Write a protein that binds this ligand. Structure first.
Ligand SMILES: [Zn+2]
Ligand SMILES: [Zn+2]
Lengths: 45, 337, 64, 108
């Protein structure tokens, strides 16, 4: 369930191995990975 | 053959001297061996104001070294509680993660630091004894009940602006007892933490530890705690006849009160304390010879303004006690030999 | 970008006077009267609001 | 108690008890300057001076050179006591004044 948001459509595309990297509902060629809930620790200094 | 025992005289091109002549051997007879009773007799504390978050006591009759010790204790050695670690589960905001952690560290918490203790080195976990945990979890959604409008609060708004109200205390241990429901909270409920747009979410856990304003400013409990020596203004000559008003304008306005003793107008020094040193008489060229303005020797004026963690009087008390604790620590380490 | 939480030189907390400042300026008050009505006495705090440029409102306008 | 967050004493050339340099760790100009002011009031000390060794470090050096008799460790241990007495008196006086002002203001 690796999601990628389109560049201007903003549709969640899930891509894999061996498949092209175009976007559904459009045809753009740039897609940003999505932020999942993972724990990271930062210091307030 | 003329002694001036109490004032720090001053002109324009520089101040005259940096001494106070109240130490051992500093005079033929006016020698000192630290008479404790003379101190306890000549010392007096007077408070000009005490709103909440303000104090303006006087502290008459103490040296500059002790006053400066008190001032430096309030700024950098009285302990406070503040966010040290931030665990970020998700953060789809425009504000970065490190910048969010920074902004969260500088938010003042209302926990009193005297009921807590310092986390031992490498105590990452923490316990009811040394830590407080708070949670901010907010998501922005469009409101379904909105017309074609553009005010950001009316539409595009369930949580457009994340405030300190959104932060919720997670009682860590038995701290729910000991601390009643409203006692442990951020001091201000309106501090803007971030801004969100529909679909954006913040979710994090903040850990607050104890510390002094010396190793980081976030832990400092006062806006400012400075002091100023009491000004002294003396009219060497009776100013009158429309020069009294020019005199009254060369000073902070309350200092020279122009009375009307006769048909003519006399200027009198009503309240020397209001004076800000602006030395604007020294530009007058005819009245720089009439007024002498200096400072009272050991008469201070303090002003402590807390952020909201503790009241100012409690802050001053804990500062004096921190100085006493330094002295006692070194006394007892000396007695260890 | 967003209002600093505490004034840099002093530490006084000014992060809660942004919306109040904006509201007193919409009511017709000068920046001087407005900064006075908020409790910002010393000019180190007054510069913290007087010269703030809210660029979080221009970044919060490009797509999600 | 603490072997080095506190005192390290260096007796001078010839280990002159009348000339000692105390190293006080975790201290800045606050205690240094107040304690030097309190030790200067003793007529039995001929030279008292403190100094910070380096900004990066957190420690001060006091130098007490007393007169012929006393070992220069009594002037230090007496300046400490007088400073703590002054702090206790200031605390008492300040709390009494705050209480009096609170009453005067709550009555009226
Ligand atoms: Zn698309
Ligand atoms: Zn300020």
């Amino acid at each position: 369930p690796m999601i990628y948001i389109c560049g201007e459509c903003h549709t969640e595309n899930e891509i894999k191995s061996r498949d092209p990297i175009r976007c559904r509902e459009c045809g753009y060629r740039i897609m940003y990975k999505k932020r999942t809930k993972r724990l990271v620790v930062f210091d307030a200094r | 053959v003329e002694e001036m025992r109490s004032r720090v005289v001053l002109g324009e091109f520089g101040v005259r001297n940096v001494h106070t002549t109240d130490f051992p051997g500093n005079y033929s007879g006016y020698d000192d061996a630290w008479d404790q009773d003379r101190f306890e007799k000549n010392f007096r504390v007077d408070v000009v104001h005490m709103d909440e978050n303000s104090l303006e006591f006087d502290m008459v009759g103490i040296d500059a070294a002790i006053a400066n010790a008190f001032r430096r204790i309030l700024l950098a050695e009285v302990p406070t509680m503040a966010v040290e670690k931030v665990l970020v589960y998700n953060n789809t905001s425009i504000v970065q993660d490190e910048i969010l952690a920074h902004r969260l560290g500088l938010i003042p918490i209302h926990a009193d630091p005297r009921l807590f203790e310092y986390r031992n080195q490498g105590d990452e976990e923490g316990t009811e004894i040394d830590t407080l945990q708070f949670r901010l979890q907010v998501r922005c959604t469009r409101n379904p009940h909105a017309a074609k409008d553009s005010s950001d609060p009316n539409e595009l708004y369930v949580n457009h602006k994340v405030y300190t109200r959104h932060m919720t205390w997670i009682p860590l241990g038995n701290q729910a007892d000991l601390f009643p429901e409203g006692t442990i909270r951020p001091v201000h409920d309106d501090i803007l933490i971030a801004q969100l747009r529909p679909g954006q979410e913040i979710d994090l856990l903040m850990h607050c530890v104890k510390g002094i304003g010396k190793d980081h400013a976030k832990f400092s409990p006062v806006a400012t705690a400075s002091y100023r020596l009491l000004p002294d203004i003396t009219l060497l000559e009776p100013v009158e006849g429309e020069a009294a008003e020019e005199l009254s304008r060369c000073f902070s306005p309350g200092v020279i009160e122009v009375q009307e003793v006769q048909g003519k107008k006399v200027a009198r020094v009503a309240n020397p304390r209001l004076d800000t040193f602006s030395r604007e008489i020294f530009r007058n060229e005819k009245l720089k010879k009439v007024v002498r303005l200096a400072r009272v020797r050991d008469h201070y004026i303090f002003s402590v303004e807390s952020t909201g963690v503790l009241p100012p009087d409690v802050l001053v008390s804990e500062a004096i006690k921190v100085l006493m604790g330094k002295c006692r620590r070194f006394l007892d380490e000396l007695d260890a030999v | 970008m967003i209002i600093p939480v505490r004034c840099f030189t002093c530490g006084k907390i000014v992060g809660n006077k942004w919306e109040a400042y904006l509201g007193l300026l919409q009511a017709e008050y000068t920046e001087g009267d407005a900064l006075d009505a908020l409790g910002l006495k010393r000019y180190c705090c007054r510069r913290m609001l007087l010269a703030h440029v809210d660029l979080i409102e221009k970044l919060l306008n490009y797509a999600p | 108690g603490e072997r080095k967050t506190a005192l390290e004493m260096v007796q001078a050339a010839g280990t002159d008890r009348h000339c000692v340099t105390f190293v006080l760790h975790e201290e800045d100009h606050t205690l240094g300057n107040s304690l030097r002011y309190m030790i200067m009031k003793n007529p039995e000390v001929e030279f008292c001076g403190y100094t910070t060794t380096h900004p990066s470090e957190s420690k001060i050096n006091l130098r007490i050179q007393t007169r012929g008799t006393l070992p220069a460790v009594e002037p230090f241990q007496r300046g400490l006591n007088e400073l703590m007495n002054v702090c206790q008196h200031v605390l008492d006086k300040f709390e009494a004044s705050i209480k009096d002002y609170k009453d005067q203001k709550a009555s009226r």
